[PDB]
Symmetry: D2
Subunit: 141 residues, 4 copies
């Protein structure tokens, strides 16, 4: 569609933390938001996890949040996975219908970059291991 | 584990066709079996589909079967996907527990190669777009 | 750098066809230009070739040119490769210093998208097999 | 061919270290040998470097050597790359004709696994980031 063009308002969705608190994407409004949509059985998604974590470490304390969002059909394999593989970033999970119907999340790995105005920078953002992601992030920070 | 070593007997599992008939992996005993475990939301899995189909075309009429097996949690998005994307190979689907607990299918894309004796050639077989898969298949044919 | 930002003028470079005629990127000014920088020993580059060719077929007769540009250190393995693997798109080759020093081509696979004004749309464009490339191309056509 | 089948003797080749000393693959006879054939402009090759290094760290002091071997046409961009990107593994470089003509190294990324008897385990070995490489390495150690 065209509601995903750069400059278009980001579409809010809800997500759960590992403690079960519901959060909203809009809660992070005012910060650059880089989203990693992954699932526990997606090999290539997990291959981007070190880069995503490393980016999260590099930009710690800057006005950007890195949101790893599991799209696992159910919560339990997500929590079991996290139990055996430590991560540093705060982890989220979502089956919000808005992912499929507003963000057009048809395939993963999928990355999304949103600016401080809560507008889309790239709805199909470069992967965290790409050579250009840092430069892109710096441009919007 | 070690029940997945080459030479080990292949582990049977059941799968559904698009008409709903239950089939067994063991039904293909006597033919080389090359399995593509994919899901409709796995981008990198779908990226291997042209190569898998092309291989299926090249070896048509040889004593080998190419089994694309969806691991989608439910049947409906699998059928909807197939509705919009034609394929030539006969399509299957499975949530058999044996996939996770005997074949150790933890991540996809995942490929499996079994010989005519129904023994494992490689439980973590090369991808269909790899340079060596044809040679490997020819070795076991 | 920042001479690669979207909206920045594209940087011209020269390229050879298989007949040895020198062409310039600027020769295609007025058409959308989608560039595939590859090399004969780059496996993942060649894995994008069917998608690049398929795109070239889909947009045939539209005001867009698809430029596969080999960056092989020398011409001979490029011609030998082409001899054994037919393609439909007109093939080019370049070792122009502008690739490394103006376009920052440090790694391949690398794709570039330029608009009809000869301005950069994305200097690190999505791969031809990506779900969003068609939509991106359509936006600039 | 068939001189690359598992169980076939490994084919020796020469390689340079960063100090310029010529070494031979056969110098490592008696140890498991896992080879990473990469080049400085191969993006996907460099994406496997953290996994290759991590494996090297995990098996430190075991009877296995991890050989990163640059296939860059010339030595200078290899040394310049290494200058700006630190690594822990001892680095090698090779343009030995045996790579192309005996090991059939046509595309990279390419990995090779050899046993203590200096026999081929897999001439097209799994990538270092694959789920099965550790198990494979353990089987031959
Ligand atoms: Cl998507
Ligand atoms: Cl798996
Ligand atoms: Cl590049
Ligand atoms: Cl190769």
């Amino acid at each position: 569609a065209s509601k995903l063009l750069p400059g278009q308002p980001a579409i809010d969705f809800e997500m759960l933390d590992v403690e079960g608190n519901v959060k909203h994407l809009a809660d992070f409004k005012g910060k650059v938001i880089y989203i990693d949509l992954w699932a526990t059985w997606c090999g290539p998604c997990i291959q981007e996890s070190p880069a995503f974590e490393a980016l999260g470490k590099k930009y710690v304390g800057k006005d950007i949040v890195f949101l790893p969002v599991s799209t696992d059909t159910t919560t339990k394999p997500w929590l079991r996975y996290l139990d055996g593989h430590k991560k540093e970033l705060t982890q989220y999970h979502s089956n919000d219908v808005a992912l499929k119907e507003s963000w057009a999340i048809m395939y993963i790995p999928r990355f999304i970059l949103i600016d401080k105005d809560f507008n889309i920078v790239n709805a199909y953002a470069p992967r965290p291991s790409s050579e250009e992601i840092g430069t892109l992030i710096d441009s919007v920070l």
